[PDB]
Amino acid sequence: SNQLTAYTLRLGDNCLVLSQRLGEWCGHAPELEIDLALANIGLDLLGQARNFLSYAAELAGEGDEDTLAFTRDERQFSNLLLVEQPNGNFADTIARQYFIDAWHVALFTRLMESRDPQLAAISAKAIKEARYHLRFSRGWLERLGNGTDVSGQKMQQAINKLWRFTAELFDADEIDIALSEEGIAVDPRTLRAAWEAEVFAGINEATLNVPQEQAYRTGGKKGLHTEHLGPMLAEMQYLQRVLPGQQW
């Protein structure tokens, strides 16, 4: 029950932290339509976070999505390092989104066959949304990489700059593996082929290059984060820390 709780929480944290990042874009986008789109994706992901976290709280027998989001520190948060990367420029946001969406699509497709009924249901909802997210993120990857000389370079730079964090997408620990043998979790290593087939084709079609750097960064799932997470949480949790245990 501990493993399942940690696993569920990881999926929640990914969606929560990425949602936070997308929230920062509100009203700062290149076009009103992109503002709308980014807020929509932010909203979907937050919905998924609430679902996963609610289930994790139910699994642990105490707390709720709010105790989990607002009362854990950065050593307890278990999101992928990828979703905590700063927004940077629009290419950086698009690269981060495309990598995550391609991964969400591959994951939720398989996790909807989970022997855990709540995980299956949550994933059935999430997959429909991730498909929308992937169309938009892949769409922009192609528009920017095969846009101008200048947008092509920014998109290549964005891909290069995030690549090292992709290793965590296929990192398996004993929680993953144990839950996967019970037919409950998806073994992240077996996601590589689908993610690579999608991402390599998208990068090619955008007239861009797959980085040759072997990706090497992991630790998010274990609460070992980049220096980005702490200030994110300081901002996200402030009011709850000041005024704990209230209804809002």
Partner: protein, 304 residues
Amino acid sequence: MRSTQEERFEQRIAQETAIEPQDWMPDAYRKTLIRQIGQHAHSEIVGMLPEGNWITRAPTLRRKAILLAKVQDEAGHGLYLYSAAETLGCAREDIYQKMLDGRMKYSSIFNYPTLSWADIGVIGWLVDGAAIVNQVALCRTSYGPYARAMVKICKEESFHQRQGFEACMALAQGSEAQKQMLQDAINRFWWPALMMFGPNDDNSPNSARSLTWKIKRFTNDELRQRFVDNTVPQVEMLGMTVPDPDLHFDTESGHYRFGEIDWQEFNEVINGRGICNQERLDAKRKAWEEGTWVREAALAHAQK
């Protein structure tokens, strides 16, 4: 003598026949609607910023999800309003540029800062509240596209106004610190919300023509009075006060009598000298300029 074109128009207005994009209209009527619909559209865009200021800090996931939906709806409302303005022959890109340069206005209310979470619920409650009264009054505006845009929008917006009120209710029923937070937000946003209805009826240069041409169906003062009458009981429901020593019920008229607006502040604000005017336009200019390469990428890719 009015021309035959001018006379037919006056008669169409009198009979409440909706004016459509292909109908003849006085050039001054076309232009005042580009002015008004355009500044209405601008307001939805700038209006994302004060509330959006709190998206990353919202105290629960539920309230964060509601606020995100609401900011998304506002963007959608801007789009509807830009489409409506374009039926009058203006270009979205041009009037947006005018907005960025300070040559077109947006609503005075968005030049006020969000200094606490309570401000967010108060905006949903008072600011959307004032918007709704104004916008419902405009569902019979004489220009079809504008009236139909108001119908589409009020449906979605009244939901978010209710959610803002519910957010206020949680604070009103919460701890002492939460109650205080709520009162302070009301104290800071009450008069600004009243100013959204525009100047007094004898200091309002557009009203004579707007009323005659049935663009404006109720006077600024009429709508403002209606908002005060509707909202005071909601303040009472929250166990809160209004920062107005002159607010009292007048049994004889059936209305709340309320204090004088600070018109000197209002004129400072609409002329670019409010609390956040510079910051709001800077954020929008920054978004536009830094986004240039993205828009050019999109155009260059479409063409290939």
